[PDB]
Design a protein around this ligand. Structure first.
Ligand SMILES: Nc1nc2c(ncn2[C@@H]2O[C@H](COP(=O)(O)OP(=O)(O)OP(=O)(O)O)[C@@H](O)[C@H]2O)c(=O)[nH]1
Ligand SMILES: Nc1nc2c(ncn2[C@@H]2O[C@H](COP(=O)(O)OP(=O)(O)OP(=O)(O)O)[C@@H](O)[C@H]2O)c(=O)[nH]1
Ligand SMILES: Nc1nc2c(ncn2[C@@H]2O[C@H](COP(=O)(O)OP(=O)(O)O)[C@@H](O)[C@H]2O)c(=O)[nH]1
Ligand SMILES: Nc1nc2c(ncn2[C@@H]2O[C@H](COP(=O)(O)OP(=O)(O)O)[C@@H](O)[C@H]2O)c(=O)[nH]1
Lengths: 430, 431, 101, 51, 430, 431
């Protein structure tokens, strides 16, 4: 009735999907084999003749290794064998490779399975595309799939949880290139794009979790908790029910400005747990702290446009109202003049479930703050010169040209990002 | 399921490839008789990348060994791991190229190249999907360099989109092993620039320095140098054969390494290289691996990175490690040695992580540096080639094999062009 | 008994026909036999894999297959012996044809 | 008839099977006569003489 | 009461008969010895006073090897020794040899035993003739037997499950010759000719069963499953019972047009089972997929004239109606303008039994789709030029002439096949 | 229950037949004393095709051994399987034909042919059903060619409908043994065209080639050539003797092979013939068997198929194999080599499959190809025959036996007409 189709593209998409689906299985009581010992799973799972629950997800990749890890792992009997789609040749961090030459047949098969999955849903709230902006599979194939979905499905709300390059630390060299290309691609195709930065999540793990050696599994666990907190209102009832379709209506002041910071609170280990009050006001303040943001971007630089809060657990409308009133009265947090309210509070009666073997503690309250703010143009300013600095020398441009791209396409993407910078400045302005 | 076709050329290439196949069989748990004995599942998951299934449980390397003399591969076949290779993959003549690139590329290698390509096609067509070819050989030798360049040209013609990886042992600076090393190197560099997509540069004297200083061996025979080279050669493709936390195939490395098409030469190194004395005293940690990685002595190439600037650098780590640790270490390296890193590339590190370290090391790392330092090596080859070419010394042999004089001048012109490219990008300023 | 010999030949032939249906299918089935990370195939792994194959064969005959596949008196099946007994034709075909033996 | 009653194609049949065959040929034959012929055909065998 | 006499002519006939009778023994519980540990076997077996069940079958061949393989296999005590009829000399892929010189006495004895079998049947739905169009034994002797049956029995429904040469792959050289000759023969005698191609069944085994090395045992198992689904309504009760006589009334618009494409669904191995829904709609769609067809003939080229569906197992008439309505509304499937209904649905409560040691899995639902369509003219067009290319040079003609034929026989067969081509063109056209 | 009457003629024919009977007895588990010692039911299931039961369990070949000199079959009796043969089936004269076809066909063959026909008729009348006769002999020899052609004519007269199969050892192209080989071959080919229904052409030099290049033997005697010929002779009829997934008798092979009655000469080859060294190494698969059989070097005929065009070709496989795999491989062969296949036949391949491989071999496959390549062989034999006949060298030896000179001209004309038909069907165009 409230079905949402999940897509995971690229290594990062599939690896955060592992955490997300582990989290949903733990939340709904679904064993990894597929079945559990009302109808709260329908948003993510469809039950078959044997009673087995299969997730409405699609693991897409041009590289076979990442998908075969799932085919061999504990979640081999849960996912559908044809839902796991594997390519033959990796995109090799080439947007052209993942969008123009290799990705064609794979995305055609992807649309085939997506149509099969959508025909299994009475309603369809929308799509949750989890990819990695900064790689050929993540950028190119994800952009192509988003384009195809926009063409055919039409009105389905597509939420892209994109992982963008960190400011200074990075693992790819053409990462600014394919990041700018994918940003141009999804500026018009996704409905709500959520920014995530590995450096910021690493800082969160280092300070809040006291993990001196964070890794991708830890990062994906935090991301999975954020996404589950986002979708909790679809699967569990609570005061001030929040909806996928109304994320837009309460969050996107203008269609271009749909990139969103995310921040989780509390982020505390077991040893530091039950040591502080962790009240609603304190956790809201922590969520609005710059350190808790999962993107390396100071919120104090820009002005918030909208803030949607998803509370999980024992939260009362008085507590959320008082916390938001204190936040509004606070002088450091600055909102735009044209949005006097700028707040969308929604509570859920289901506390966040804790994945065994993880570092997050069992907290009776949790906040996922997703904010549309003009400060995010600052990371775009970072990528916009990381792009053009190499583009002056046309470094690695032949690699992209070889698979059917043009200098005009890079220029158009960079120009579109400059237009986005202008847009951010204007919307921040009065 | 992305297969790699291995090719060995010349005496040096054949010996290095034999050591490499011994190393890879050890990594995959394959005994010299071909049976799998690894008792380990990830070893057999991607065994098809290098080996093919025989009638029994035997596995045969997808390797093609070439030569113009029979002695080298008689020794190779009689070696410890000689029985794995298919005897049909031994393509060799009767008269060797007398360290003559012209002989190995025009006169004697040309008749054998038909059989070589026949075997190459037979091995490649059996592959489901082909990542590409890797050719191990030595610049500065007749049969090796000549037939290697010819085969690379032919395979480039046949499979333009497939990856080409080369491991060339460039002649050492201070001591020269064969007299016509500058001619052979100059002619082979010309072919490698034009044809080979990715090329690894190795030096025997640099290997001697590293194995006497870091490893501290007393009498390192060629087997030890070949073991180092094989370690690097395995580590470069371990991300294909094993699951990785952040995996990177050969094409990903090529894309993230090569800024401009002709600047595809790299200097490589392997870490952690420890002397047996200080194995206990060292701490096997990611910062230690990075520090040893970025040392100039750890570079297997004669050129030291300090004179040049790193255009790009990939580091393929292996083992259960923190990606935050790795990324922070490489960012710290770039910030500390910003003078040695090119300004107009915001990030000069391509970090890859594989979850399966080599047997014996909890953590390991192979480093692949594209730096302008190789400029001085090409310059030294220029200084030797021009010195001999002024007086036409030893040139009449290449003339008598049916090669124009202008082929030499074209080869050295292209190699000087590559030199000046490296200089221009070394001193290129942003904006 | 000739009946038991014919049963062994027929069962080995059936398994060899079920496997070897495509290239490297023997390898894929071998990797699927063992849940654990070691290549050695345990008796329980062997019974579970045969059960995964849609073959109705008693535990006694499965144990006979396990012993006939040379364990080297170790009790675990290696890939070499797995291939040796489940090759296309070979021992299976010879045993199937040699009825009078 | 012996081939039809021999399921294993082993060329050998038990006493019951060959008595059944001999009765299908000639009804009046008893099992003792068939067993005696079996013994005179193969002196030292644990049954299963070649038909 | 509903007895059906089975005839298996040639090597292909006997080899598909082995699988067919194995399947029937498994279905009715009849052990290979002959007897079982009611009256559902009457269609295929006749019980004796001792309790032993003997099939109402006749294995006809001019080569002793194939029949002796039955005499020496597991099914020795089941079949009647005289019912197994063997020749002394093979027809050597010569239609003349099998129809004029060797086949006379063998077919005369075949009529004798067929008469003895028919005298044992109170009712008689018809004959199931399984032969090999493309070989002297199957083609010539089968044609002669069909002619004699038409002469004497008259109006009994003869259903010929013929195996035609595949388009490009084949095993014989004079296969076009004897195929064309037998086609002229059976155009005028058989009542419904179910067409089968080895290439098509090989593709089915490769794609659906994942068998890259299919064999004749696999092909015969598939054919046996198809025939068992076809005859299931004779032996087991079901809603919408369908009869042998109902096949032609609901499938044959004109007497000349009685060739039928066959398609079984699902075809899934043990590993791939229980992983997809395998619902009524999905299996109907799979049956209508061109790839699952058992003739190398794309139905998209032609138009369906009639489609008879045999559903087996837990199939509910509402679901079959919904699936067939979806098929009708589908644009890709095209029916002739003069057959608005074009559908004959029939359900049976008996799920298809699975052969132990076979590749097919245990499925609770099954569809056998047998369609009269004008697309089948394509395969006759292929054989019509494969024949004339050889006949222009009169290659291998002397072989056929030596055993009592004339050039006029070849000319008449070619002319009649051309007439059949034009008849198919006319019925397809408005 | 379809019996075959084997006949051996001449020295070469007798020795080939002895080796063939050794091979067949080994396959059926027959010891030299004739008692069955095979322990496999299918061996005795169809043993009657070649053997008859004696008073005891002894099984004796249905073979008729023809010669004009006694020493050859004294050696045959002394051979390892010399006493299996019925002693009454040894028909030999006293004085051999001095490599004179005239002596073996007219003067000395006339007296002994009555006894030969009596033995042949006695062997045929005992047969329940007769598939036909197979005559193994050598063109280019006196008694062999002469008596073989005369007996073939007599058997054709007596049993016109019964199949006739010939294994003729055509004289070698390059190295000839005797001088009058062209005369004997020319006179015998004329008879074989008219009488023999199905003919296999064999060359000693072609066999020598296969035994140096595939088998890699060192000093192979005539026993090895006879062994390979015996392999082909067994494999052609293994479908009669063993159950087959798609069986095919001799008449089926002839019907699918012979487009027009005079074009009944075929080249044959056997697979897999491999050397000892690479036996562990070679992959035993249907594609490998097809690749080997379609090779020109695998042919036991001297003519290479590349020059000609394949009119028809039958392949009889042995072993538990995929019929789809076989059919796909041979269709792929046709599609790849469509230039070598005749256009006006849509399918030039007759596939037969038997379920019993020969002893020791996991798989096997025998090939029988009707191609216009044999045109060059007949042309060469005509080139020698005309060269001698222009000067009438050695013609007096034949003329003194009472045959006209006109017979030589008629034989040459018939042989040239056969060559012309082969060329016509090589260059025939569809429509
Ligand atoms: N947060 C997070 N990021 C990841 C993770 N895994 C990979 N990434 C990021 O994803 C980027 C590359 O992802 P992909 O493009 O999918 O890599 P791939 O699967 O080999 O596909 P291509 O590189 O495009 O050929 C890297 O820059 C990483 O920073 C992960 O587990 N967590
Ligand atoms: N589908 C299928 N077709 C088969 C099978 N076996 C043989 N055939 C086909 O049957 C054709 C020949 O059959 P037959 O005529 O009966 O062969 P035969 O029994 O030796 O009789 P002749 O060939 O006429 O002498 C071949 O072209 C094959 O395509 C089988 O098991 N399944
Ligand atoms: N690392 C290593 N280098 C070698 C070995 N053998 C030879 N070389 C080097 O390879 C260079 C060229 O020799 P090579 O090309 O093999 O001679 P060729 O075979 O006649 O062409 C020489 O300068 C040697 O220093 C070896 O076993 N290991
Ligand atoms: N393959 C094979 N060829 C032989 C053998 N013996 C002789 N030949 C060849 O057969 C040719 C004809 O000899 P042959 O007809 O037997 O002599 P004849 O019996 O006196 O007429 C000779 O040129 C020999 O080269 C043998 O044992 N095997």
């Amino acid at each position: 009735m409230r079905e949402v189709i999940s897509i995971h593209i690229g290594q990062a998409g599939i690896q955060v999907g592992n955490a997300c689906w582990e989290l949903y299985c733990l939340e709904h009581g679904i064993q990894p084999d597929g079945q559990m010992p009302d109808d709260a799973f329908n948003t993510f799972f469809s039950e078959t003749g044997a009673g087995k629950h299969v997730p409405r997800c699609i693991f897409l990749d041009l590289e076979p290794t990442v998908v075969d890890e799932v085919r061999t792992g504990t979640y081999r009997q849960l996912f559908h064998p044809e839902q796991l789609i594997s390519g033959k040749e990796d995109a090799a961090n080439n947007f052209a490779r993942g969008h123009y030459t290799i990705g064609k047949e794979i995305v055609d098969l992807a649309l085939d399975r997506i149509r099969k999955l959508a025909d299994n849903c009475t309603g369809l709230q929308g799509f949750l595309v989890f990819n990695a902006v900064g790689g050929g599979t993540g950028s190119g194939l994800g952009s192509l799939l988003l384009e195809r979905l926009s063409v055919d499905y039409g009105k389905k709300s597509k939420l892209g949880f994109t992982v963008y390059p960190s400011p200074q630390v990075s693992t790819a060299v053409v990462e600014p290139y394919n990041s700018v290309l994918s940003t141009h691609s999804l500026l018009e195709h996704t409905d709500v794009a959520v920014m995530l930065d590995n450096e910021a999540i690493y800082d969160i793990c280092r300070r809040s979790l006291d993990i001196e050696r964070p890794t991708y599994t830890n990062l994906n666990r935090l991301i999975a908790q954020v996404i589950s907190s986002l979708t909790a209102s679809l699967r569990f009832d609570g005061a001030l029910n929040v909806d996928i379709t109304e994320f837009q209506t309460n969050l996107v002041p203008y269609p271009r400005i749909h990139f969103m910071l995310s921040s989780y609170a509390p982020i505390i280990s077991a040893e530091k747990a039950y040591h502080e009050q962790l009240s609603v006001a304190e956790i809201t303040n922590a969520a609005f702290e710059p350190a808790s943001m999962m993107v390396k971007c100071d919120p104090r630089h820009g002005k918030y446009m909208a803030c949607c809060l998803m509370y999980r657990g024992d939260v009362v409308p008085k507590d959320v109202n008082a916390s938001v009133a204190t936040i509004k009265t606070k002088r450091t947090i600055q909102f735009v003049d044209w949005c006097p309210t700028g707040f969308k509070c929604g509570i859920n009666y289901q506390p966040p479930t804790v994945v065994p073997g993880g570092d997050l503690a069992k907290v009776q309250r949790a906040v996922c703050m997703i904010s549309n703010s003009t400060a995010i143009g600052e990371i775009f300013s970072r990528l916009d010169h990381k792009f053009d600095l190499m583009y002056a020398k046309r470094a690695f441009v032949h690699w992209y040209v070889g698979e059917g791209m043009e200098e005009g396409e890079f220029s158009e993407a960079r120009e579109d990002l400059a237009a986005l910078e202008k847009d951010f400045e204007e919307v921040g302005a009065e | 399921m992305r297969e790699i076709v291995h090719i060995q050329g010349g005496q040096c290439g054949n010996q290095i490839g034999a050591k490499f196949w011994e190393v890879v069989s050890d990594e995959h748990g394959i005994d010299p008789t071909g049976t799998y004995h690894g008792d380990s599942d990830l070893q057999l998951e991607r065994i098809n990348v290098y080996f093919n299934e025989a009638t029994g449980g035997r596995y045969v390397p997808r390797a093609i060994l070439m030569d113009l003399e029979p002695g080298t591969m008689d020794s190779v076949r009689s070696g410890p791991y000689g029985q794995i290779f298919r005897p049909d993959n031994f393509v060799f003549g009767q008269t060797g190229a007398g360290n003559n690139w012209a002989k190995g590329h025009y006169t004697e290698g040309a008749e054998l190249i038909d059989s070589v390509l026949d075997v190459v096609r037979k091995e490649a067509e059996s592959c489901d999907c082909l990542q590409g070819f890797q050719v191990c050989h030595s610049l500065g030798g007749g049969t090796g360099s000549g037939m290697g360049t010819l085969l690379i040209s032919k395979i480039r013609e046949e499979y333009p989109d497939r990856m080409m990886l080369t491991f060339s042992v460039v002649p050492s600076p201070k001591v020269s092993d064969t007299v016509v090393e500058p001619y052979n190197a100059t002619l082979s560099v010309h072919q490698l620039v034009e044809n080979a997509d990715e090329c690894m540069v190795l030096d025997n004297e640099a290997l001697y320095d590293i194995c006497f200083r870091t490893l501290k061996l007393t009498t390192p025979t060629f087997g030890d140098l070949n073991h180092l080279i094989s370690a690097v050669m395995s580590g470069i493709t371990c991300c294909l054969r094993f699951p990785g936390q952040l995996n990177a195939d050969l094409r990903k490395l090529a894309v993230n390494l090569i800024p401009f098409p002709r600047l595809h030469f790299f200097m490589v190194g392997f870490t952690p290289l420890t002397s047996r004395g200080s194995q206990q005293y060292r701490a096997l940690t990611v910062p230690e691996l990075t520090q040893q990685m970025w040392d100039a002595k750890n570079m297997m190439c004669a050129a030291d990175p300090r004179h040049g600037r790193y255009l790009t650098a990939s580091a393929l780590f292996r083992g259960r490690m923190s990606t935050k640790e790795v990324d922070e270490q490489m960012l710290n390296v770039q910030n500390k040695n910003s003078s040695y890193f090119v300004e107009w590339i915001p990030n000069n590190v391509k970090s890859s992580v594989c979850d399966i370290p080599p047997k014996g090391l909890k953590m390991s790392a192979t480093f692949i540096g594209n730096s302008t330092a190789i400029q001085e090596m090409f310059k030294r080859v220029s200084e030797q080639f021009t010195a001999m070419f002024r007086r036409k010394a030893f040139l009449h042999w290449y003339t008598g094999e049916g090669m124009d004089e202008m082929e030499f001048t074209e080869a050295e012109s292209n190699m000087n062009d590559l030199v000046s490219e490296y200089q221009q990008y070394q001193d290129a300023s942003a904006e | 008994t000739f009946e038991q010999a014919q049963s062994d030949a027929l069962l080995t032939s059936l398994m060899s026909t079920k496997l070897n249906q495509y290239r490297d299918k023997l390898r894929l089935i071998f990797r699927q036999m063992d849940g654990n990370r070691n290549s050695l195939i345990d008796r329980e792994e062997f019974i579970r894999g045969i059960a995964k194959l849609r073959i109705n064969v008693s535990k006694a005959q499965v144990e006979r297959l396990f012993d006939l596949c040379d364990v080297d008196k170790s009790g675990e099946l290696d890939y070499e012996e797995f291939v040796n007994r489940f090759e296309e034709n070979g021992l299976a075909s010879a045993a199937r044809n040699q009825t009078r033996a | 008839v012996f081939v039809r009653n021999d399921l294993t194609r082993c060329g050998q049949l038990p006493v019951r099977d060959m008595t059944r065959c001999c009765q299908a040929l000639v009804p009046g034959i008893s099992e003792r006569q068939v067993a005696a012929v079996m013994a005179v055909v193969d002196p030292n065998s644990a049954g299963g003489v070649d038909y």
